[PDB]
Structure formats: structure tokens, C-alpha cells
A paper describes a structure:
Autophagy-related 8 (ATG8) proteins play a central role in autophagosome formation and selective delivery of cytoplasmic cargo to lysosomes by recruiting autophagy adaptors and receptors. The LC3-interacting region (LIR) docking site (LDS) of ATG8 proteins binds to LIR motifs present in autophagy adaptors and receptors. A genome wide siRNA screen identified the short coiled-coil protein (SCOC) as a novel positive regulator of starvation induced autophagy. To further understand the role of SCOC in autophagy, we identified a functional LIR motif in the unstructured region N-terminal of the coiled-coil domain of SCOC.
The SCOC LIR:GABARAP complex structure revealed a large surface of interactions between SCOC residues 6 to 19 and GABARAP. The SCOC core LIR motif displayed the canonical LIR interactions comprising the hydrophobic residues F14SCOC (Θ0) and I17SCOC (Γ3) deeply bound to HP1 and HP2, and three hydrogen bonds formed between the main chains of the SCOC LIR residues T15SCOC (X1) and I17SCOC (Γ3) and the main chains of the GABARAP residues K48GAB and L50GAB. On top of these canonical LIR interactions additional specific contacts were observed between the SCOC core LIR motif as well as the adjacent N- and C-terminal regions and GABARAP. In the region N-terminal to the SCOC core LIR motif we observed: a salt bridge between K6SCOC (X−8) and E8GAB, two hydrogen bonds between the backbone of E10SCOC (X−4) and the mainchain of D45/K47GAB, one hydrogen bond between the sidechain of D11SCOC (X−3) and the imidazole ring of H9GAB, and another hydrogen bond between the carbonyl of S12SCOC (X−2) and K48GAB sidechain. In the C-terminal region, hydrophobic interactions were observed between L19SCOC in position X5 and the edge of HP2 (L55/L63GAB). In summary, SCOC LIR domain binding to GABARAP is stabilized not only by core LIR residues but also by multiple interactions involving residues of the N- and C-terminal regions flanking the LIR motif, which range from residues in position X−8 to X+5. In line with the GST pull down experiments, biolayer-interferometry (BLI) affinity measurements showed that the SCOC LIR binds strongest to GABARAP (3.6 µM) and GABARAPL1 (2.3 µM), followed by LC3C (8.7 µM) and LC3A (27.8 µM), and weakest to GABARAPL2 (44.4 µM), and LC3B (270 µM). Removal of the N-terminal sequence (except for T13SCOC) resulted in a profound decrease (more than 140-fold) in ATG8 binding to the SCOC LIR motif (aa 13–25).
Numbering used by the authors: -20 to 112
Write the structure that this text describes.
């Protein structure tokens, strides 16, 4: 409907809105060999858990995470991870949250272990960006 449209305020659009533009700070500030060594060791020690780096997407105006480096059970679902991150950023239930891994939204029925197997990087970490709508 017309009421659903916006033609009065300017909407700013830029490459900040392209999730493919995301750059994880963790990969800038920590050298590859240190990341790889730590991820390799943690996966050997806890084969039923996956190491995950979570950072906020460029455009997003929602809350920040106090911690970015997580160890997650492989059997945790994407929906459960959404819920747990939502609580950590204090995002009210009424507002949408999105995850992106390698520029795609995860499949609904994926577990964190399935996401890890398909998308982990050569440093043994899985990188997840989170954003608002």
C-alpha cells in the first residue's frame, strides 16, 4: 500500500549496505598462523564444539557484542544461536536479526556444526556477521 511506501525522507544507500563488503576485524588484528594454531587445537580438544567469531555487519544500528570469540556445541541450531546472540545484544524480540556466513544467510535447519563443516576458514574458525533488517 501507499502508506507502506516512503517518499518524504531520503534513504541513504551505499556499499555499507552490501554484506559482501564486511571485513572482520579479528582477521586483521590476529595473524593467520596464531588463529590457525588456536582453532586447530580447540577442534582437536573439543570435537563436539565449533569455534566461531561473531561481528556486527557494517550498516547495522543494533547493539554490540561484548565478546566476539565463542565455542558453540555442534548440535546447536541456527535458530538457537540467533536467540542466544539476540539476548547478548539486548535486541527486543519484535525486531529482526540476520546472520551471514560467506555472504549467505544460513539454511533454516542448519546446526552450527553443519555450518562449520561447510563454511569454516583455513584458520579453523567460522565467521558470522549479524545485522538488522
Amino acid at each position: 500500500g501507499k502508506e507502506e511506501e516512503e517518499d518524504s525522507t531520503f534513504t541513504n544507500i551505499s556499499l555499507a549496505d552490501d554484506i559482501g563488503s564486511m571485513k572482520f576485524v579479528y582477521k586483521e588484528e590476529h595473524p593467520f598462523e596464531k588463529r590457525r594454531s588456536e582453532g586447530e587445537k580447540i577442534r582437536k580438544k573439543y570435537p563436539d564444539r565449533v569455534p566461531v567469531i561473531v561481528e556486527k555487519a557494517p550498516k547495522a544500528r543494533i547493539g554490540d557484542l561484548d565478546k566476539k570469540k565463542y565455542l558453540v556445541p555442534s548440535d546447536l541450531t541456527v535458530g538457537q544461536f540467533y536467540f542466544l546472540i539476540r539476548k547478548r545484544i539486548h535486541l527486543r524480540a519484535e525486531d529482526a536479526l540476520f546472520f551471514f556466513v560467506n555472504n549467505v544467510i544460513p539454511p533454516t535447519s542448519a546446526t552450527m556444526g553443519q555450518l562449520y563443516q561447510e563454511h569454516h576458514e583455513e584458520d579453523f574458525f567460522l565467521y558470522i556477521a549479524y545485522s538488522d533488517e
